Design a protein around this ligand. Structure first.
Ligand code: 5W2
Length: 111
């Protein structure tokens, strides 16, 4: 049951990586490369960076005890984007499209 919700989480993350969503999901695939992007204030603003590849590693390492812990890291990834960037920034629009994909499926988690 907890195992079953974690399988749902693995399926959700797999969809977030699917080519269908790549046009807006790709900025979230990997840790933000603050040095390559020139984001010299990023570590002053974001205390706990998170990205889809790290979430994938933690799922395989069994670091999430249940779906709520998984969901928290996904929401942290999005919240980090909304916190760091101006609300009209293009990457915020991309976060919103990816968060729609996540939330709609996360809401179908089995009881
Ligand atoms: C998860 C995440 C959260 N916040 C931000 N913020 C941010 C905010 C701004 C700049 C930016 O200013 N980049 C300059 C613009 C052109 N230059 C030649 C150097 C890089 C910036 F890169 C990132 N990014 C994230 N990921 C991310 C990963 C890779 C890339 Cl390439 C980008 N670039 S982006 O945001 O400009 C775009 C996706 C709309 C094209 C973003």
């Amino acid at each position: 049951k907890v195992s079953e919700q974690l399988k749902c989480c693995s399926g959700i993350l797999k969809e977030m990586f699917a080519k269908k969503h790549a046009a807006y999901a790709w900025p979230f695939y990997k840790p933000v490369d603050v040095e390559a992007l020139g984001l010299h204030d990023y570590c002053d603003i974001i205390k706990h960076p998170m990205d889809m590849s790290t979430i994938k590693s933690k799922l395989e390492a069994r670091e999430y005890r249940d779906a709520q812990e998984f969901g928290a890291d996904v929401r942290l990834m999005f919240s980090n984007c909304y916190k760091y960037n101006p609300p009209d920034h293009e990457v915020v629009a991309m976060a919103r499209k990816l968060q729609d994909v996540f939330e709609m499926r996360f809401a179908k988690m089995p009881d």
